[PDB]
Amino acid sequence: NGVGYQPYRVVVLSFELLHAPATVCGPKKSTNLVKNKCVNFNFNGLTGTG
Amino acid sequence: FKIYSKHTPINLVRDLPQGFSALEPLVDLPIGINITRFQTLLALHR
Numbered sequence: 587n588g589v590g591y592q593p594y595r596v597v598v599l600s601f602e603l604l605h606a607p608a609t610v611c612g613p614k615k616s617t618n619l620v621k622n623k624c625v626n627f628n629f630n631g632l633t634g635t636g
Numbered sequence: 637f638k639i640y641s642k643h644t645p646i647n648l649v650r651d652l653p654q655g656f657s658a659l660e661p662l663v664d665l666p667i668g669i670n671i672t673r674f675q676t677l678l679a680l681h682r
């Protein structure tokens with residue numbers, strides 16, 4: 587068949603939002619843990635140094 | 637919508653015992669819906 591008449595598969599994704607807490611959250615980067623030295627740390631939103 | 641529970645045996649089934657024990661959390665719900673009334677579910681053979 588012609589190129590314009592060739593069958594194509596299409597996938598569509600849609601968005602909806604609510605005041606309830608969000609449930610679909612993609613990952614974030616993370617590094618390796620270090621011992622016995624002064625260092626800033628962030629653990630699940632908890633921030634500190636030591 | 638948060639749930640707390642614990643389990644303990646009983647040998648004085650007639651009424652609630654004395655003492656003190658704390659409830660631990662086990663599961664949470666992000667549902668966000670409104671709740672005003674509640675009921676219970678039972679089971680029986682017939």
Ligand SMILES: *[C@@H]1O[C@H](CO)[C@@H](O)[C@H](O)[C@H]1NC(C)=O
Binds near residue numbers: 668
């Ligand atoms: C729940 O009740 C509040 C007022 O108590 C109302 O504003 C809200 O629209 C109701 N529904 C939800 C889903 O929060």
